[PDB]
Amino acid sequence: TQFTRFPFQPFIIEAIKTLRFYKPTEIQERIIPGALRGESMVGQSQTGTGKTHAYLLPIMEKIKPERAEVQAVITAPTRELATQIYHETLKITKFCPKDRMIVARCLIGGTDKQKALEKLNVQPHIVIGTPGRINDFIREQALDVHTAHILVVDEADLMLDMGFITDVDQIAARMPKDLQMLVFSATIPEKLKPFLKKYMENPTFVHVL
């Protein structure tokens, strides 16, 4: 595996090998180091687990397992997109050392019967979900994103299109001022720039072509 180029914890290296990842992709190569440094970034890329990993891997590297608080919030426009990111996350977390387990929950709602089954016992280290669903948890006083310093907005353009950027803004609103934001989008709509300018100052931009 070439991911050794990144200073990841052993368990992460092991997860990577298990994901059958030999050489970091372009999106990965350009995002990981920056992410690890704590830079806010905007990556223009096609959807894909390679891109998913560009953010998950560095995010896993920084969780503080000891602290049972939300440390990372990841948003996606659809239930399905969110579910897939959660799948990718579990393939990494299954490798955590037993006394240092990272917990992730996926909040996507669904039918009312489904919604009612979705509950938060603990404050997961990582919260994945659609923005409105995540807002529902905040609204219901069950989730504190104030402890999280990482926000990921995936498939940003589509997000905008479905009318969810207001939900995301809200969430980012409630997070620390010194927030690290990672945005991924195939494209950069005009109606999207303000959200970006608002929460990010001197963000690193990546484009894969």
Side-chain angles (χ1 to χ4, degrees), residues 2-13 16 24 27-41 53-64 92 149-150 152 180-182 184 204 206:
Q2 327 159 188
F3 289 64
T4 278
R5 275 183 286 165
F6 314 108
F8 284 132
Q9 289 157 252
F11 86 82
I12 295 186
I13 289 311
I16 290 175
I27 181 101
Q28 294 166 351
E29 256 161 14
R30 310 171 179 181
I31 291 269
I32 303 177
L36 291 174
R37 284 176 219 133
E39 311 160 6
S40 280
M41 327 179 69
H53 285 285
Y55 61 83
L56 297 174
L57 299 174
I59 281 163
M60 302 287 327
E61 179 56 44
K62 298 196 32 93
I63 301 301
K64 276 178 315 333
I92 295 163
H149 302 249
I150 296 144
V152 180
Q180 167 173 25
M181 183 181 276
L182 311 166
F184 307 84
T204 289
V206 169

Side-chain angles (χ1 to χ4, degrees), residues 73 75 79 106-112 114-116 118-120 123 127-145 164 166-168 170-171 174:
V73 177
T75 64
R79 289 171 89 257
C106 184
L107 317 168
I108 54 168
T111 70
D112 304 315
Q114 286 178 320
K115 285 179 151 144
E118 277 187 325
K119 312 262 332 163
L120 299 164
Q123 286 295 281
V127 165
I128 293 151
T130 57
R133 196 59 186 137
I134 284 164
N135 273 330
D136 289 346
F137 282 78
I138 292 175
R139 195 200 334 313
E140 313 173 350
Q141 307 167 248
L143 174 74
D144 188 7
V145 303
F164 304 160
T166 169
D167 310 55
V168 187
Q170 296 187 117
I171 295 169
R174 307 236 170 68

